């Protein structure tokens, strides 16, 4: 932590000469700041939140002053809340996977967003009964979407 050398001086040398002007295309700081309001789920929520998503997805279609009506009015909103919460929980993985092809002309945020769209697919195109850890399935779909984007270049 408290070390100074010529070899360590270089690491600030190059950054100082080059990075006075901000190349915003890779300035991820705002998005990472926004994601940071997150903590990892567990298996119990991994099942419950997907079930809630399915219930709300059914309710929003079926809907097209008594407890029968109140219950579905509740579920329709709760399922969308569940979808949003799960996506927000998994964003960090999208970032960590978007790192893997940076530097080859592609801006990091583009990979982030392509992986995010793949994840937005993953949140709903899923069944809890399969038993797979959701993070691995999310990684699969994020990488698939990122390479689909990389099919265009």
């Amino acid at each position: 932590d408290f070390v100074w050398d010529e070899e360590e001086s270089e690491a600030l040398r190059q950054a100082r000469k080059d990075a006075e002007l901000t190349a915003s295309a890779d300035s991820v700081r705002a998005y990472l700041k926004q994601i940071g309001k997150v903590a990892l789920l567990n298996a119990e929520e991994e099942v419950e939140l997907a079930k809630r998503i399915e219930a709300g997805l059914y309710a929003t279609q079926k809907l097209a002053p008594v407890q029968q009506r109140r219950d579905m009015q509740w579920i329709c909103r709760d399922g969308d809340r569940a979808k949003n919460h799960l996506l927000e929980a998994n964003l960090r993985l999208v970032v960590s996977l978007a790192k893997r092809y940076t530097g080859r002309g592609m801006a990091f945020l583009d990979l982030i967003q392509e992986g995010n769209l793949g994840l937005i697919r993953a949140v709903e195109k899923f069944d809890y009964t399969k038993g797979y850890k959701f993070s691995t399935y999310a990684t699969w779909w994020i990488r698939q979407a990122i390479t689909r984007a990389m099919a265009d270049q």
Binding site: K51, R52, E54, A55, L57, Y58, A59, Q61, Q67, D71, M72, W74, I75, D78, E124, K125, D127
Partner: peptide, 26 residues
């Protein structure tokens, strides 16, 4: 919406909705 009906039977979706409603009423 299509993938939910296609992947699982409507009976399972109805059962899940009923379970959610009960867990909200419990």
């Amino acid at each position: 919406w299509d993938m939910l009906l296609e992947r699982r039977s409507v009976e399972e979706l109805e059962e899940l909705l009923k379970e959610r409603l009960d867990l909200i009423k419990a």
